[PDB]
Enzyme design. Structure first.
Site, PDB file in Angstrom:
ATOM      1  N   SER A 144       0.851  -1.292   0.038  1.00  0.00           N
ATOM      2  CA  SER A 144       0.013   0.065  -0.018  1.00  0.00           C
ATOM      3  C   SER A 144       0.667   1.192   0.026  1.00  0.00           C
ATOM      4  O   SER A 144       1.976   1.082   0.435  1.00  0.00           O
ATOM      5  CB  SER A 144      -1.082   0.062   1.264  1.00  0.00           C
ATOM      6  OG  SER A 144      -0.242  -0.027   2.514  1.00  0.00           O
ATOM      7  N   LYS A 145       0.411   2.157  -0.485  1.00  0.00           N
ATOM      8  CA  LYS A 145       1.068   3.693  -0.751  1.00  0.00           C
ATOM      9  C   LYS A 145       1.769   4.106   0.728  1.00  0.00           C
ATOM     10  O   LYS A 145       2.621   4.909   0.464  1.00  0.00           O
ATOM     11  CB  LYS A 145       0.097   4.847  -0.919  1.00  0.00           C
ATOM     12  CG  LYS A 145       0.436   5.954  -1.556  1.00  0.00           C
ATOM     13  CD  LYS A 145      -0.374   7.106  -1.794  1.00  0.00           C
ATOM     14  CE  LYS A 145       0.440   8.505  -1.924  1.00  0.00           C
ATOM     15  NZ  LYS A 145       1.348   8.746  -0.594  1.00  0.00           N
ATOM     16  N   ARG A 146       1.169   3.867   1.843  1.00  0.00           N
ATOM     17  CA  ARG A 146       1.697   4.418   3.032  1.00  0.00           C
ATOM     18  C   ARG A 146       2.775   3.539   3.782  1.00  0.00           C
ATOM     19  O   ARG A 146       3.521   4.059   4.517  1.00  0.00           O
ATOM     20  CB  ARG A 146       0.749   4.677   4.125  1.00  0.00           C
ATOM     21  CG  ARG A 146       0.345   5.964   4.304  1.00  0.00           C
ATOM     22  CD  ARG A 146       1.370   7.023   4.352  1.00  0.00           C
ATOM     23  NE  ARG A 146       1.071   8.314   4.474  1.00  0.00           N
ATOM     24  CZ  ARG A 146       2.306   9.433   4.659  1.00  0.00           C
ATOM     25  NH1 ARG A 146       3.581   9.103   4.309  1.00  0.00           N
ATOM     26  NH2 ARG A 146       1.836  10.806   4.813  1.00  0.00           N
TER      27      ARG A 146
ATOM     28  N   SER B  14       4.777   1.297   1.574  1.00  0.00           N
ATOM     29  CA  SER B  14       5.565   1.102   0.689  1.00  0.00           C
ATOM     30  C   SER B  14       5.297   2.241  -0.683  1.00  0.00           C
ATOM     31  O   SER B  14       4.681   3.043  -0.561  1.00  0.00           O
ATOM     32  CB  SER B  14       5.252  -0.360   0.126  1.00  0.00           C
ATOM     33  OG  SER B  14       5.651  -1.416   0.928  1.00  0.00           O
TER      34      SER B  14
END
Ligand SMILES: N[C@@H](CCC(=O)O)C(=O)O
Ligand SMILES: [Mg+2]
Length: 468
Positions: A245-247, A249
RNA sequence: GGCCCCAUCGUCUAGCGGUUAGGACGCGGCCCUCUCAAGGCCGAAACGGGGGUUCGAUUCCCCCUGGGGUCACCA
């Protein structure tokens, strides 16, 4: 034959999960002399991000994949963007209505929430609305959605080519919305209609879609079509094992390109997320991967995406796969971005050659070798200290240097070896302080090539400011 | 929580009844060497637990535990 596809949703940055899945679709299609399609799945106007579509298409090309049909390459089953196919889904939803496989439902989103709170999911209450009345309420314009009318009670078999058969109890399958009240289809409706019409025979997608597969098996049945084969790939994971996920990785392909990761390396790493060569080799081309691909060699555990191993690999491509000249070309944008210029191709190539084993990303090159392109470089405390300590012997060496007529890495080595000898000191005692003078750092490539690289004039000019 | 998928070093993995359980990243040590790297060599590091099947389980079966996914008028 074999037709596969990648079907990105334009609702954010180009996602690594997309490249990953696109990579296996592309390989399976080629391995079989089949076709690989791109279908833009823009059915949700709320999450739609203008500009996202072009960005994902460019990233797939950047990564090295090519598709045979799609938004920007044409094809006989276009359009390849779902927002332009609305009338089609509309038509098929209504055909399900007639076949008795769907029904109109008029609950407001608020009522649904309440229903969900009381029974944890829609209870199919609209199935009880008389068909003729539903039809009339539709003609009067009353907003509504069309839902899948799941066969209850019942059982539904889904076959995943890598895991075997799974038998869902229909009670686990909801009466899903197929056509929203704004007249847009939901993902479930469009995916089945388009895979069919575009002729896909092999659906390779991320495991997150596994449980939604029984909804698709039913729709294929409802339309009286033949279901394609399903292969669900494990999700790429954050270091904590949750789906990447964006937060936790970096999931943007744009980030990777911006950071100077080569597409070839990123692509080679993604192949290792679930696949491996028989002989255990880890560095291989896109073409080799295609030729060796086999589902027998795909592992099903969720792979943690390891940035460190990606960097290792990127450094490995920079030093062993690409040629010197290719690395020099690719390093230019980063030099430009850093505001640095190179005197000539010849100079840049030699500079890149000296640094080849010292940078793992193209972005690192301008950072670690800034002194090779500008006078505006930083001098570390340890370097400044080494410089001060060696000033006395540097001053004694300077004249011998302004005298050396042949400025070569062999000549200079001989000159410096002799000087250290005649001074009864270790070369390092003279090389390190000189390195600091020329580069403002104690971590650089070989002194003689560093000294030779700029030519006598430039070298001494810099040596002089340090003796000043 | 219901349902579903998964299970070898910290991580990516090889292994499809019998291996000293192999490779790679990362970690440590050595060699090379004018620094830092690159490279070479060595090393530490795994089969989650319990049953069964079998002459013999990492491997085939069940349970458990553990991890993950999924339950929207999002995809
Ligand atoms: N639009 C879906 C497509 C997945 C599929 O069925 O392949 C996505 O999120 O990628
Ligand atoms: Mg071991």
């Amino acid at each position: 034959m074999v037709v596969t596809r990648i079907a990105p949703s334009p609702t954010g940055d180009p996602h690594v999960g997309t490249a990953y899945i696109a990579l296996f679709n592309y390989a399976w299609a080629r391995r079989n002399g089949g076709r690989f399609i791109v279908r833009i799945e823009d059915t949700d106007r709320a999450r739609y991000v203008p500009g996202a579509e072009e960005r994902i298409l460019a990233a797939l090309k950047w990564l090295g994949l090519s598709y045979d049909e799609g938004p920007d390459v044409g094809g006989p089953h276009g359009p390849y963007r779902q927002s332009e196919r609305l009338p089609l889904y509309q038509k098929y939803a209504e055909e399900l209505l007639k076949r008795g496989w769907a029904y109109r439902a008029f609950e407001t989103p608020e009522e649904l929430e309440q229903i969900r709170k009381e029974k944890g999911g829609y209870d199919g209450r609209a199935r009880n609305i008389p068909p003729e009345e539903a039809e009339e309420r539709a003609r009067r314009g009353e907003p509504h959605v069309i839902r899948l009318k799941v066969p209850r009670p019942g059982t539904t078999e889904v076959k995943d080519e890598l895991r075997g058969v799974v038998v869902y109890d229909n009670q686990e399958i909801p009466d899903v919305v197929l056509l929203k009240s704004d007249g847009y289809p939901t993902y479930h409706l469009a995916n089945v209609v388009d895979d069919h019409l575009m002729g896909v025979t092999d659906v390779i997608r991320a495991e997150e879609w596994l449980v939604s597969t029984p909804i698709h098996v039913l729709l294929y049945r409802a339309f009286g079509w033949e279901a394609p084969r399903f292969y669900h790939m494990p999700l790429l994971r954050n270091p904590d094992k949750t789906k990447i996920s964006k937060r936790k990785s970096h999931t943007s392909l744009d980030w990777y390109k911006a950071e100077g990761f080569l597409p070839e390396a990123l692509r080679n790493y993604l192949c290792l997320m679930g696949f491996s060569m028989p002989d255990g080799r880890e560095i291989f081309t896109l073409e080799e991967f295609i030729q060796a691909f086999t589902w027998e060699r795909v592992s099903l555990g969720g792979p943690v995406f390891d940035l460190e191993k990606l960097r290792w690999m990127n450094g490995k491509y920079i030093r062993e796969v690409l040629s010197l000249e290719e690395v020099a070309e690719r390093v230019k944008p980063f030099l430009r971005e850093a505001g640095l210029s190179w005197e000539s191709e010849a100079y840049l190539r030699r500079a890149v050659e000296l640094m080849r084993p010292r940078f793992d990303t193209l972005k690192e090159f301008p950072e670690k070798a800034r002194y090779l392109f500008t006078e505006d470089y930083p001098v570390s405390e340890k370097a400044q200290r080494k410089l001060e300590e060696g000033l006395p012997l540097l001053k004694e060496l300077y004249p011998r240097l302004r005298a050396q007529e042949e400025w070569t890495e062999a000549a200079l080595e001989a000159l410096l070896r002799g000087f250290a000898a005649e001074k009864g000191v270790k070369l390092g005692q003279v090389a390190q302080p000189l390195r600091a003078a020329l580069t403002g750092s104690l971590e650089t490539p070989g002194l003689f090539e560093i000294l030779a690289l700029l030519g006598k004039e430039r070298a001494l000019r810099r040596l002089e400011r340090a003796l000043a």
